[PDB]
Amino acid sequence: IGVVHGMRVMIVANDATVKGGTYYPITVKKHLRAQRIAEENRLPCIYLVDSGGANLGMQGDVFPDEQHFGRIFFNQANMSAKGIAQIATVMGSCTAGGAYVPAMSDESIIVKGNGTIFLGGPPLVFAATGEEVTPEELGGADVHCRASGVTDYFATDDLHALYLTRRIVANLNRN
Amino acid sequence: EVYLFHPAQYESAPATTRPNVLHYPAESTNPEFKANTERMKALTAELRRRVQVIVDGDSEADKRARDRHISRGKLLVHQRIEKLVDPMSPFLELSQLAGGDLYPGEACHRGGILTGIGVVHGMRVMIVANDATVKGGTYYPITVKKHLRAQRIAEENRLPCIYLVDSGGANLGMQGDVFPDEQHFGRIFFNQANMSAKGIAQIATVMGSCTAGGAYVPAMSDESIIVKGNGTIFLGGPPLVFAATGEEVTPEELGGADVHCRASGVTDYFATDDLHALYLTRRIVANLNRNDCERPCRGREFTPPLYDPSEIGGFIPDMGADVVKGFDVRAVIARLVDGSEFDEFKKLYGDTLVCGFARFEGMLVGIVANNGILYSESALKGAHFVELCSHRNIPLLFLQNITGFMVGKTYEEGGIAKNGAKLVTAVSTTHVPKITIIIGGSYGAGNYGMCGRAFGPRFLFMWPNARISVMGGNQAATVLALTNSKLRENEVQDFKAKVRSKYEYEGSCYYSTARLWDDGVIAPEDTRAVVVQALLSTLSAP
Amino acid sequence: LKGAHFVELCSHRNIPLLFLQNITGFMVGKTYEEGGIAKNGAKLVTAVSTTHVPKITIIIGGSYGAGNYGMCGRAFGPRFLFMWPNARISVMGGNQAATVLALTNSKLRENEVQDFKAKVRSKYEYEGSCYYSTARLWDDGVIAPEDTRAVVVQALLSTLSAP
Amino acid sequence: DCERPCRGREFTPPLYDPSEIGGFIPDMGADVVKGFDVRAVIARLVDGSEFDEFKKLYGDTLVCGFARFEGMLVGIVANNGILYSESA
Amino acid sequence: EVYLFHPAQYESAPATTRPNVLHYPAEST
Amino acid sequence: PQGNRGTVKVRLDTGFRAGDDVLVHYDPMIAKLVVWGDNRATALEGLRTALASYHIVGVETNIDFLQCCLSNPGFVEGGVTTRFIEDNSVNLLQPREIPNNVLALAAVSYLCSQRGTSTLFWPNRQISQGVCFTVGGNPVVVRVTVSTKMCFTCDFDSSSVTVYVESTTNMPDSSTFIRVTVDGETRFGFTSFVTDSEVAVALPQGFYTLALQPLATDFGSTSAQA
Ligand SMILES: *C(=O)CCCC[C@@H]1SC[C@@H]2NC(=O)N[C@@H]21
Ligand SMILES: *C(=O)CCCC[C@@H]1SC[C@@H]2NC(=O)N[C@@H]21
């Protein structure tokens, strides 16, 4: 829980230095706990997204259940419906299920070089259609900020992304 | 060397380095800039001249009527406004140029009625004052429409209503367009009763006459004031009572102040003259147990715009032309918002609809402005931004310069109608206050997508260069010429010229204003001020 | 006063209201104005305007002037409004309009009195007819008197789904 | 402590001494009871002796008006004679 | 000479001229 | 300014403070002001300067009479007879002229006192205001048109005065210091004090008090009949 522009917010940031940011069962549990605290205290949520996705080694304990990876999106949608702002800043990668985090937020930010959003990664698209595409040309900042419309703010680097996040928080009409 | 600063440093930075500051300096040496400035100056001078001739009167008949009005011990309507409102306070007069060239043979100044938002004892109120110097104060259809519009604004903003009544009644020459309908003279009493039921105070001060239907205005108000000499209230006038019972009675002994203040009980306060009447009105307003503010927070730490509004006209091209040039609406926004700061929402997606956040004297406002042809992406962006502002209770400001959507088989196949419908639905179903200003042209369904008159904005104003029509004049000429196969090749230019002239005449700002299609014409340099006042008027809304 | 009290009584019971308009204004005179006839008409108008029960009005006779306003006219939001083919709606009666305009207009000469009265009477008859009102959506149609009951029933049923 | 932090304590004491109110009060127990103007009482109870009368010429036996007690707005209804239909 | 003042002047006036002030001096004699 | 000045010593002795009410027929003397110099002429000049700086608002005084006596040639010549006051009664009782600049500045100061933080705005119009003063029993009226840029234009007979108010500052002594530009070329600051009955301005030209037109005591008088 941090203070941005004098307002208390709940900040959830992926650590890409821990197995590439992949979600362990404990990672999902901690994310859900943060969402629960934010929802019951009406704290706006900021998600700094840099994660490979759910780890396939323990997918049984991560993907299918009530308190599992989809509950993140359930909580995000329900908080957005209750007027609690959901902000996503894509500092890195978000693949498959994680790609819902920027798309289901009220406002989203993507960094140019390192920000990529796609439901199907380059390995999947090559295994499906036999085509080779880089992550940048598949789900980079240009495609999602100029054509797709998934993201709302184009960030040149991490510092610009954090500035844009603060600007988004500044314009929440919260007394 | 990498990531040395903190984002708060950029947030609190001089205007040169603050990244959310719009930088649009005036190209004062550019000949096109000078031509645009000259055009805007001429238009604004004409606007001020029309307002001034309305205030001071032009013809000799106006002078005679004003002399008769003064000789009766009556104050003029604008003088009544000046002496009723707090001495040094703003007054937002709405339909200044209503009734202009509307009824041939009559100079219906102000539509026969002055409506505005004033400040009495620090509280914003809606003032509706009849002008007895315009055909004796009789209600034209435009007069009824303007009175109803003032009542609508007051009801939707919970502004107490003050009616300074001096009117002969509905004019019998046009009774078909005045008496019978939903939006006709009885709707005034319907609105008055419903506002009184909702706790919105209705105050009537009878400075002159009120006959027949108008007599309901004092009687249906919470508190009423009648002036001794000039105040008369009766359902049936002396001509009617003589034609009925054969008796002759003067208006004073029929419905004067004594009979309605000592015996009838219709009125509550006896006024010796106009000044005493205005004093009693102020005393009534003083005793409305309305709290000064729900929240005592001020938040007045704002910075004026960094660029002079007086050069806005330099960026505005000629709207009436064979080929209309395009301009960046941000140059306008930089001259209207606090510190020229503007957080753009989707800077790279819409690219023809600019959506962003700004502040007017510390009040946060979402701005939606046209910057070219509407596409599916622009409509989706506008709808998403309107939803975002609605979820945050952020008021919306629309800046309309629109020439329809993009046509073509590909665009229809992509669902442009569906996305335009999404934008229209988002604009229609929101509950935040909405203010729209026509800075350019509003043509066709695009108007509907940009919070037109039909979509219930709190206020709507037009710049003197603005044009509103079902379609552009050039577009109308081309389409009508192409469709009309009966037209001969020898008679093409004359037909195009005629239709262009008709659309120019019926699309002008004055044509719209005379018909209460907007809430007045304002100069671009005053735009910011107007917006602020409008925003303040919405602060008492539920 | 009786009409206002009855409208309040029906509103407190959620009883729909049916107005049958044949009205030629209020009673004029010094005594009646001194007694506060405008105040009582205002009470009736307020009661009609501020009620929430469904209201249906039918013009069976004439609706003239402020009396129309007191009897749930078009401006006061009835659910439906119908006119009989003999009905007339105007700001004032044709004879009343002719007499008042002739008496007020001092410019008019004695030689040109009958023609002026005939012209104004014809204008009021033309603009007050049921068809003139119907063509301008001032009502919800013209119905025969013998069908009136049926029409009312349908209208009432249409209001059964109202909140 | 308070729903609304507004104070509004900028009031003025009555301009006439309350200690002489009894001078205006006649003997209630008497064969014929004299009448007095209740406004003289009101002038010694409200802020600045200010009083906005509601219908000064209609009731004439029931004085209705607005006043303030230490900045608090209050409607005053006072008897000033026999009740009539107009006064009621 | 006619309508020279503003009603706020009468609203903010000394007790002698403020028109909504009740004047009932005691007839102590 | 009391004490040891540059060339003279000024000493003021008074029994009244600001806010006190002087009651008539009981000690009519408001104060006594003494000035010491090296010569009689220097003492007289110092007394003139000190009297010019003595600003009293609320009670009529004889400051103008004292200035006339001090500036009288007979007094400055030397010793004068006892009947001197009776000798130069016409000269000493000369009325003080009030230029239109003083009227305009007083009206502007009164309007600024009326204004709080509200902005003067009427769309496509100049806000109209009026201030009524009494000059020698004459009800003079100043009509002012004010724009959103805090620029007043006051109208007199065949005369117009433009006053641009740069800034205002509320002094702790219930007064206001106003910086103005008269016409388009005369910049200066002055002090203004506004009551419900008069407006006082301390201009570089001197000190002036203009009485507002008194309010009627029978405003809205309805004595049941006439
Ligand atoms: C000539 O004036 C007609 C050209 C077409 C006008 C264009 S087509 C795209 C825009 N949409 C619309 O309705 N009018 C504009
Ligand atoms: C002739 O047609 C005019 C006579 C008056 C008409 C009467 S007076 C009483 C009723 N009220 C009203 O408005 N008209 C009716």
PDB file of N, CA and C in Angstrom, chain F residues 31-64:
ATOM      1  N   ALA F  31      -8.045  66.285  19.459  1.00  0.00           N
ATOM      2  CA  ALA F  31      -6.624  66.117  19.738  1.00  0.00           C
ATOM      3  C   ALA F  31      -5.934  67.471  19.688  1.00  0.00           C
ATOM      4  N   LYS F  32      -4.668  67.480  20.101  1.00  0.00           N
ATOM      5  CA  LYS F  32      -3.805  68.642  19.944  1.00  0.00           C
ATOM      6  C   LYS F  32      -2.482  68.190  19.348  1.00  0.00           C
ATOM      7  N   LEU F  33      -2.065  68.853  18.275  1.00  0.00           N
ATOM      8  CA  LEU F  33      -0.873  68.475  17.528  1.00  0.00           C
ATOM      9  C   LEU F  33       0.115  69.629  17.575  1.00  0.00           C
ATOM     10  N   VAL F  34       1.310  69.375  18.102  1.00  0.00           N
ATOM     11  CA  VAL F  34       2.331  70.402  18.252  1.00  0.00           C
ATOM     12  C   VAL F  34       3.531  70.029  17.393  1.00  0.00           C
ATOM     13  N   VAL F  35       4.102  71.033  16.737  1.00  0.00           N
ATOM     14  CA  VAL F  35       5.268  70.860  15.881  1.00  0.00           C
ATOM     15  C   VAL F  35       6.312  71.887  16.288  1.00  0.00           C
ATOM     16  N   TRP F  36       7.537  71.424  16.513  1.00  0.00           N
ATOM     17  CA  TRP F  36       8.656  72.275  16.888  1.00  0.00           C
ATOM     18  C   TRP F  36       9.698  72.249  15.780  1.00  0.00           C
ATOM     19  N   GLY F  37      10.150  73.429  15.371  1.00  0.00           N
ATOM     20  CA  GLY F  37      11.201  73.577  14.391  1.00  0.00           C
ATOM     21  C   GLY F  37      12.278  74.517  14.898  1.00  0.00           C
ATOM     22  N   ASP F  38      12.959  75.159  13.952  1.00  0.00           N
ATOM     23  CA  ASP F  38      13.939  76.188  14.272  1.00  0.00           C
ATOM     24  C   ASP F  38      13.420  77.595  14.025  1.00  0.00           C
ATOM     25  N   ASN F  39      12.501  77.757  13.080  1.00  0.00           N
ATOM     26  CA  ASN F  39      11.906  79.042  12.762  1.00  0.00           C
ATOM     27  C   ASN F  39      10.397  78.872  12.673  1.00  0.00           C
ATOM     28  N   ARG F  40       9.682  79.997  12.744  1.00  0.00           N
ATOM     29  CA  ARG F  40       8.225  79.944  12.680  1.00  0.00           C
ATOM     30  C   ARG F  40       7.750  79.382  11.346  1.00  0.00           C
ATOM     31  N   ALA F  41       8.414  79.756  10.250  1.00  0.00           N
ATOM     32  CA  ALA F  41       8.022  79.245   8.940  1.00  0.00           C
ATOM     33  C   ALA F  41       8.199  77.734   8.856  1.00  0.00           C
ATOM     34  N   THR F  42       9.323  77.222   9.364  1.00  0.00           N
ATOM     35  CA  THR F  42       9.550  75.781   9.350  1.00  0.00           C
ATOM     36  C   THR F  42       8.533  75.056  10.220  1.00  0.00           C
ATOM     37  N   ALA F  43       8.209  75.625  11.383  1.00  0.00           N
ATOM     38  CA  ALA F  43       7.199  75.020  12.243  1.00  0.00           C
ATOM     39  C   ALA F  43       5.840  74.991  11.558  1.00  0.00           C
ATOM     40  N   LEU F  44       5.483  76.071  10.859  1.00  0.00           N
ATOM     41  CA  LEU F  44       4.213  76.098  10.141  1.00  0.00           C
ATOM     42  C   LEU F  44       4.187  75.067   9.021  1.00  0.00           C
ATOM     43  N   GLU F  45       5.290  74.931   8.284  1.00  0.00           N
ATOM     44  CA  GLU F  45       5.341  73.926   7.225  1.00  0.00           C
ATOM     45  C   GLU F  45       5.221  72.519   7.798  1.00  0.00           C
ATOM     46  N   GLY F  46       5.906  72.255   8.911  1.00  0.00           N
ATOM     47  CA  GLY F  46       5.782  70.957   9.551  1.00  0.00           C
ATOM     48  C   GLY F  46       4.374  70.685  10.041  1.00  0.00           C
ATOM     49  N   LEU F  47       3.714  71.708  10.588  1.00  0.00           N
ATOM     50  CA  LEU F  47       2.334  71.540  11.028  1.00  0.00           C
ATOM     51  C   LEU F  47       1.410  71.269   9.850  1.00  0.00           C
ATOM     52  N   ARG F  48       1.631  71.952   8.725  1.00  0.00           N
ATOM     53  CA  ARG F  48       0.838  71.682   7.529  1.00  0.00           C
ATOM     54  C   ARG F  48       1.022  70.243   7.072  1.00  0.00           C
ATOM     55  N   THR F  49       2.272  69.777   7.039  1.00  0.00           N
ATOM     56  CA  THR F  49       2.538  68.406   6.615  1.00  0.00           C
ATOM     57  C   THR F  49       1.898  67.400   7.563  1.00  0.00           C
ATOM     58  N   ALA F  50       1.991  67.648   8.871  1.00  0.00           N
ATOM     59  CA  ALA F  50       1.416  66.725   9.845  1.00  0.00           C
ATOM     60  C   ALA F  50      -0.106  66.700   9.762  1.00  0.00           C
ATOM     61  N   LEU F  51      -0.735  67.866   9.597  1.00  0.00           N
ATOM     62  CA  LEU F  51      -2.186  67.910   9.457  1.00  0.00           C
ATOM     63  C   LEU F  51      -2.635  67.222   8.177  1.00  0.00           C
ATOM     64  N   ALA F  52      -1.849  67.349   7.105  1.00  0.00           N
ATOM     65  CA  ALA F  52      -2.181  66.654   5.868  1.00  0.00           C
ATOM     66  C   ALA F  52      -2.153  65.142   6.049  1.00  0.00           C
ATOM     67  N   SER F  53      -1.357  64.647   6.993  1.00  0.00           N
ATOM     68  CA  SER F  53      -1.229  63.217   7.236  1.00  0.00           C
ATOM     69  C   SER F  53      -2.175  62.701   8.311  1.00  0.00           C
ATOM     70  N   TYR F  54      -2.945  63.575   8.952  1.00  0.00           N
ATOM     71  CA  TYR F  54      -3.878  63.166  10.000  1.00  0.00           C
ATOM     72  C   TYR F  54      -5.192  62.789   9.330  1.00  0.00           C
ATOM     73  N   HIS F  55      -5.445  61.490   9.206  1.00  0.00           N
ATOM     74  CA  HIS F  55      -6.600  60.987   8.474  1.00  0.00           C
ATOM     75  C   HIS F  55      -7.653  60.496   9.458  1.00  0.00           C
ATOM     76  N   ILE F  56      -8.779  61.204   9.513  1.00  0.00           N
ATOM     77  CA  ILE F  56      -9.873  60.898  10.425  1.00  0.00           C
ATOM     78  C   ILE F  56     -11.127  60.642   9.604  1.00  0.00           C
ATOM     79  N   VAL F  57     -11.733  59.476   9.802  1.00  0.00           N
ATOM     80  CA  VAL F  57     -12.945  59.073   9.102  1.00  0.00           C
ATOM     81  C   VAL F  57     -13.974  58.648  10.137  1.00  0.00           C
ATOM     82  N   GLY F  58     -15.168  59.239  10.058  1.00  0.00           N
ATOM     83  CA  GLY F  58     -16.270  58.939  10.956  1.00  0.00           C
ATOM     84  C   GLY F  58     -16.835  60.162  11.651  1.00  0.00           C
ATOM     85  N   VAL F  59     -16.005  61.175  11.879  1.00  0.00           N
ATOM     86  CA  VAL F  59     -16.408  62.393  12.571  1.00  0.00           C
ATOM     87  C   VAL F  59     -15.947  63.587  11.752  1.00  0.00           C
ATOM     88  N   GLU F  60     -16.836  64.559  11.566  1.00  0.00           N
ATOM     89  CA  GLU F  60     -16.441  65.806  10.930  1.00  0.00           C
ATOM     90  C   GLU F  60     -15.467  66.566  11.821  1.00  0.00           C
ATOM     91  N   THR F  61     -14.513  67.241  11.186  1.00  0.00           N
ATOM     92  CA  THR F  61     -13.456  67.940  11.899  1.00  0.00           C
ATOM     93  C   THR F  61     -13.205  69.283  11.229  1.00  0.00           C
ATOM     94  N   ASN F  62     -12.190  69.992  11.721  1.00  0.00           N
ATOM     95  CA  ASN F  62     -11.810  71.297  11.197  1.00  0.00           C
ATOM     96  C   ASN F  62     -10.406  71.270  10.604  1.00  0.00           C
ATOM     97  N   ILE F  63     -10.004  70.124  10.052  1.00  0.00           N
ATOM     98  CA  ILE F  63      -8.681  70.015   9.446  1.00  0.00           C
ATOM     99  C   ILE F  63      -8.557  70.966   8.264  1.00  0.00           C
ATOM    100  N   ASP F  64      -9.596  71.036   7.429  1.00  0.00           N
ATOM    101  CA  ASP F  64      -9.580  71.969   6.308  1.00  0.00           C
ATOM    102  C   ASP F  64      -9.530  73.411   6.795  1.00  0.00           C
TER     103      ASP F  64
END
